[PDB]
């Protein structure tokens, strides 16, 4: 077992359909690793599918400061592993429920930052001709030192703006133009994911799936919050979730706004 040798478990991080992931140890280079572990997708399967993106898309992108970093993956025994880079803060959906706990939540200048950050990386993709197409907490990772990076993470769902072949996110996070099948600004529904992702961390109350207030929400209007946060920045989340996709600002755009440092 190449797993069972040239790393050691120190903590399970993650259980599910997936399999497991686990904090491990390189017994060569003594550093940190989230390893993720699980059975052989069906053929035909978007399990599978989701793996195949992934695996091109570790190809194309290679290093980011705000993408979890691709190490290495390989198969033994009808199991997939996968090595990547260790977020010691966790998800972002951890972090948030670690904030409902705690009757805390992300204070206005750490929302920007959150934006910001996430925003960067979204760039660097779209810059590279891709799309993430699954923002979400649960898919956002942070690692923490004081100072705190947000890293982009699971690109199971990751397509070419050029020949876009879409699985479905997230119905919570999904803009509308994508559940009608139109990819022609896939870019600007990653950007409608981010703001619902940060309104999340704002401490509003879990996303509708569907119904009205689902509607409600992809018609422009910004889910109710519990704090109360800048006319300039409640703006600004209200119009990356505009109902005309194009009128949502681009990552580049997004990066270069005053309301956030
Ligand atoms: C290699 C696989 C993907 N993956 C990363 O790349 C990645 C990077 N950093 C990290 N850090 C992390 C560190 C602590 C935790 N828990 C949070 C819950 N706590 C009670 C206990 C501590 C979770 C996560 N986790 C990663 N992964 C990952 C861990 C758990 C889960 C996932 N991913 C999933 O998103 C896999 C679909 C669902 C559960």
């Given at each position: 077992?190449?797993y069972?040798?040239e790393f050691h478990?120190?903590?399970?991080?993650?259980?599910?359909?997936?399999?497991?992931?686990?904090?491990c140890?390189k017994?060569?280079?003594?550093?940190?690793?989230?390893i993720?572990?699980?059975?052989?997708?069906?053929?035909?399967?978007?399990?599978?599918?989701?793996?195949?993106?992934?695996?091109?898309?570790?190809?194309?992108?290679?290093?980011?400061?705000?993408?979890?970093?691709?190490?290495?993956?390989?198969?033994?025994?009808?199991?997939?592993?996968?090595?990547?880079?260790?977020?010691?803060?966790?998800?972002?959906?951890?972090?948030?429920?670690?904030?409902?706990?705690?009757?805390?939540?992300?204070?206005?200048?750490?929302?920007?930052?959150?934006?910001?950050?996430?925003?960067?990386?979204?760039?660097?993709?779209?810059?590279?001709?891709?799309?993430?197409?699954?923002?979400?907490?649960?898919?956002?990772?942070?690692?923490?030192?004081?100072?705190?990076?947000?890293?982009?993470?699971?690109?199971?769902?990751?397509?070419?703006?050029?020949?876009?072949?879409?699985?479905?996110?997230?119905?919570?996070?999904?803009?509308?133009?994508?559940?009608?099948?139109?990819?022609?600004?896939?870019?600007?529904?990653?950007?409608?994911?981010?703001?619902?992702?940060?309104?999340?961390?704002?401490?509003?109350?879990?996303?509708?799936?569907?119904?009205?207030?689902?509607?409600?929400?992809?018609?422009?209007?910004?889910?109710?919050?519990?704090?109360?946060?800048?006319?300039?920045?409640?703006?600004?989340?209200?119009?990356?979730?505009?109902?005309?996709?194009?009128?949502?600002?681009?990552?580049?755009?997004?990066?270069?706004?005053?309301?956030?440092?």
């Amino acid at each position: 077992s190449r797993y069972t040798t040239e790393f050691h478990e120190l903590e399970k991080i993650g259980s599910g359909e997936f399999g497991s992931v686990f904090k491990c140890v390189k017994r060569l280079d003594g550093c940190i690793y989230a390893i993720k572990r699980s059975k052989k997708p069906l053929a035909g399967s978007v399990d599978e599918q989701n793996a195949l993106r992934e695996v091109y898309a570790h190809a194309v992108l290679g290093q980011h400061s705000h993408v979890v970093r691709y190490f290495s993956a390989w198969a033994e025994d009808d199991h997939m592993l996968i090595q990547n880079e260790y977020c010691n803060g966790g998800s972002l959906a951890d972090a948030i429920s670690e904030n409902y706990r705690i009757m805390s939540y992300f204070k206005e200048a750490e929302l920007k930052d959150l934006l910001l950050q996430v925003g960067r990386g979204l760039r660097y993709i779209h810059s590279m001709s891709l799309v993430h197409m699954d923002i979400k907490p649960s898919n956002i990772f942070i690692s923490r030192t004081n100072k705190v990076m947000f890293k982009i993470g699971d690109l199971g769902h990751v397509t070419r703006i050029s020949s876009p072949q879409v699985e479905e996110g997230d119905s919570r996070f999904l803009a509308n133009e994508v559940l009608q099948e139109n990819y022609t600004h896939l870019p600007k529904a990653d950007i409608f994911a981010l703001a619902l992702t940060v309104v999340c961390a704002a401490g509003a109350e879990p996303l509708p799936r569907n119904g009205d207030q689902w509607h409600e929400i992809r018609q422009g209007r910004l889910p109710r919050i519990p704090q109360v946060l800048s006319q300039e920045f409640t703006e600004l989340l209200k119009v990356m979730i505009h109902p005309d996709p194009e009128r949502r600002p681009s990552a580049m755009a997004l990066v270069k706004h005053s309301v956030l440092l």
